[PDB]
Design a protein around this ligand. Sequence first.
Ligand SMILES: *[C@@H]1O[C@H](CO)[C@@H](O[C@@H]2O[C@H](CO)[C@@H](O[C@@H]3O[C@H](CO[C@H]4O[C@H](CO)[C@@H](O)[C@H](O)[C@@H]4O)[C@@H](O)[C@H](O[C@H]4O[C@H](CO)[C@@H](O)[C@H](O)[C@@H]4O[C@H]4O[C@H](CO)[C@@H](O)[C@H](O)[C@@H]4O[C@H]4O[C@H](CO)[C@@H](O)[C@H](O)[C@@H]4O)[C@@H]3O)[C@H](O)[C@H]2NC(C)=O)[C@H](O)[C@H]1NC(C)=O
Ligand SMILES: *[C@@H]1O[C@H](CO)[C@@H](O[C@@H]2O[C@H](CO)[C@@H](O[C@@H]3O[C@H](CO)[C@@H](O)[C@H](O[C@H]4O[C@H](CO)[C@@H](O)[C@H](O)[C@@H]4O[C@H]4O[C@H](CO)[C@@H](O)[C@H](O)[C@@H]4O[C@H]4O[C@H](CO)[C@@H](O)[C@H](O)[C@@H]4O)[C@@H]3O)[C@H](O)[C@H]2NC(C)=O)[C@H](O)[C@H]1NC(C)=O
Ligand code: NAG
Ligand code: NAG
Ligand code: FUL
Ligand code: NA
Length: 581
Amino acid sequence: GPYEATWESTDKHNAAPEWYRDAKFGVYWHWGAFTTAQYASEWYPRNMYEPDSDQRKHHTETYGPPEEWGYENFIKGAKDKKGNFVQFKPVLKSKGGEFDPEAIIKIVKGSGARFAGPVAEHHDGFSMWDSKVNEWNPVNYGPKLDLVKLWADLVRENDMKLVIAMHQAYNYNGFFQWAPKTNDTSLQKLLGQLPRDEEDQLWFDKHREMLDHVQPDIIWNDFSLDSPGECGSFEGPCAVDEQKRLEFLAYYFNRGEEWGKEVVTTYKHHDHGFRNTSAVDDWERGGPSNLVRPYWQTDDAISASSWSYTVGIKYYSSKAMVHSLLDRVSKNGNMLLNISPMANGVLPEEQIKVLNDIGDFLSRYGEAVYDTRAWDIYGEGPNQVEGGSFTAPLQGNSSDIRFTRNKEDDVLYVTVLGWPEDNLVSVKNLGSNALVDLESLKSVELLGDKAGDYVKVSEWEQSKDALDITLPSQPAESLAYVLKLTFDGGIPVPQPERGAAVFSKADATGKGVALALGTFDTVFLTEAGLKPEEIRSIRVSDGTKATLFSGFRFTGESKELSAGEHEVEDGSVGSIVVSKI
Ligand SMILES: *[C@@H]1O[C@H](CO)[C@@H](O[C@@H]2O[C@H](CO)[C@@H](O[C@@H]3O[C@H](CO[C@H]4O[C@H](CO)[C@@H](O)[C@H](O)[C@@H]4O)[C@@H](O)[C@H](O[C@H]4O[C@H](CO)[C@@H](O)[C@H](O)[C@@H]4O[C@H]4O[C@H](CO)[C@@H](O)[C@H](O)[C@@H]4O[C@H]4O[C@H](CO)[C@@H](O)[C@H](O)[C@@H]4O)[C@@H]3O)[C@H](O)[C@H]2NC(C)=O)[C@H](O)[C@H]1NC(C)=O
Ligand SMILES: *[C@@H]1O[C@H](CO)[C@@H](O[C@@H]2O[C@H](CO)[C@@H](O[C@@H]3O[C@H](CO)[C@@H](O)[C@H](O[C@H]4O[C@H](CO)[C@@H](O)[C@H](O)[C@@H]4O[C@H]4O[C@H](CO)[C@@H](O)[C@H](O)[C@@H]4O[C@H]4O[C@H](CO)[C@@H](O)[C@H](O)[C@@H]4O)[C@@H]3O)[C@H](O)[C@H]2NC(C)=O)[C@H](O)[C@H]1NC(C)=O
Ligand SMILES: *[C@@H]1O[C@H](CO)[C@@H](O)[C@H](O)[C@H]1NC(C)=O
Ligand SMILES: *[C@@H]1O[C@H](CO)[C@@H](O)[C@H](O)[C@H]1NC(C)=O
Ligand SMILES: C[C@@H]1O[C@H](O)[C@@H](O)[C@H](O)[C@@H]1O
Ligand code: NA
């Protein structure tokens, strides 16, 4: 194939193809041998060995000391302290058991997911496909089923793109740091104790074997690709050999070409192991606080506990999941939602209800979500995401709106996160203070009870503070409500209260991009719809300054501009920093 194992060659791969930007919402599942204990989290295989931990205490009381009853017993099977046989061994419904993967995939399809699939290998060394390179798999042991192939075939039967999640780097970069050393070479493979050159090779061989086996549309990767300092107390680079990373990228991108498919690979945002030229950044739970470019994704979970089922697990609400989805999509990302089947393969009814409720929302209001793109401002209102460390998912109300727009850039969707009891939606960024001319606003419509229904909004006025929209009669109840604003000849470019707007003509007209406070490089401005070489004017808000740089990313000659309108020489700007005075 045309890709070579170098950064410069692999950079040419299109990171986020149009189908992936259109998709918005996917579902995956942390289900595996790490679920067997149904205790604490999916990190149980690591923590069962940790000195003085709650997980070790539980393990020791339930099974035996971890030095005698090691993690490998969950895969190969053993008796617990009360003489019960314990093993990861889901039994198909068609064989009289409780594991019904077809039913689960129908539920996932019904949720509105446009991509779906399993965690194929987490950090615990167990590959869930029929693997020649790793004997630690569910065909050799346990259920005698190729779980990954079963899931993949069902996902394709149900007309969703296939995502496969792979977390196999941390396996040998510290996950099993507390497991006893072993001279059993097979057990060393499970526990990440092989020589590092062999482990680096195995990281690649696992990816290669899996991706040739199921032809994934997306390969999702966890951390420890090159994330020094993120592997706790283990002495090591918290990384995969660079050559092996590059060989993976070239192999997968070449296979995509061979298959006639536009493929995607994701990696954790903070990790340095891949580049954002060719791989999609996957933000920590909650996502970014701001609108980020280029296109990115984040993962979330129904569970309010761990990623994998545990006894006593608590869940978040349908509302939180839907509001979270709208938030991520408005900020130029996708949301990949995790679900948590029990060790036996049963999906709990509380999770089914959440998925059903997301699906009801998307079936009805999908026009505002699928196939849309972010505006230049993600939303308005008091309820926001902080970023950094996740506490609880976003839940908004009638005070909050999130924006999305169509590909033609003449329809703005204004999604309000509750029904306003005052029957008013006020859009600050379309008010007169926003320097927005609404002469071109042709229609304002409320999306109705079923997709394709529109109820006209008759009354609206533009104050200084906002476009003030009076709602018609409330439609059937929903978790959020959608207004559709159609403009002749393109959505107006708002002026942020503190921020700037850049334009393709010299007089603050033409194509434009609104900018908040922050830093905006050539990639940002280009993706937002205005290559910086084409900027010919800028309007800087009161209380704000803008610093223009000639370089791609805040290097080269710079010029500071205060509040007002300013002409800009063609080809003079590469990047911009917008700051509060
Ligand atoms: C995709 O991946 C790529 C690759 O990993 C990511 O690219 C990296 O992006 C980084 C963030 O933009 C970028 O880092 C910036 O580099 C600038 C240039 O550095 C080079 O030149 C300078 C000057 O010679 C050298 O000193 C330097 O060592 C480099 O060789 C730096 O200038 C940037 O530093 C400034 O910003 C950071 C915040 O990112 C501050 O912590 C820092 O103190 C600096 O702060 C000033 O400037 C920023 C403007 O960026 C202002 O916001 C801030 O208020 C400070 O303002 C003072 O100074 C400015 C003049 O600089 C003045 O106008 C102002 O009034 C103030 O006096 C920063 O370090 C990496 O270089 C880049 N890497 C590569 C390989 O490209 C990319 O981000 C990824 N994409 C996404 C979406 O994540
Ligand atoms: C005090 O403050 C100062 C100033 O902030 C701090 O200095 C900074 O310290 C950084 C850490 O040392 C230093 O970054 C390093 O810079 C070198 C030179 O550019 C760079 O090579 C380093 O990158 C390697 O190492 C990191 C950390 O593990 C990896 O994430 C990264 O992938 C690189 O790994 C490659 O090189 C390693 C050997 O160094 C190999 O072991 C590794 O396998 C890997 O090799 C592969 O990749 C190579 C290409 O990357 C390839 O050639 C090779 O063949 C293999 O394929 C790292 O970024 C900053 O430069 C430095 N800043 C300044 C201004 O000095 C200082 O740390 C502070 N002190 C304290 C106590 O905190
Ligand atoms: C494992 O093999 C090494 C090398 O022969 C040996 O030193 C060590 O004692 C062995 N481990 C055990 C538990 O016997
Ligand atoms: C919506 O949430 C905001 C922020 O917590 C709050 O100030 C406002 O009163 C809420 N509105 C309603 C109707 O509860
Ligand atoms: C999605 C989460 O990513 C983290 O890096 C992992 O360590 C967790 O177990 C989980 O898979
Ligand atoms: Na690219």
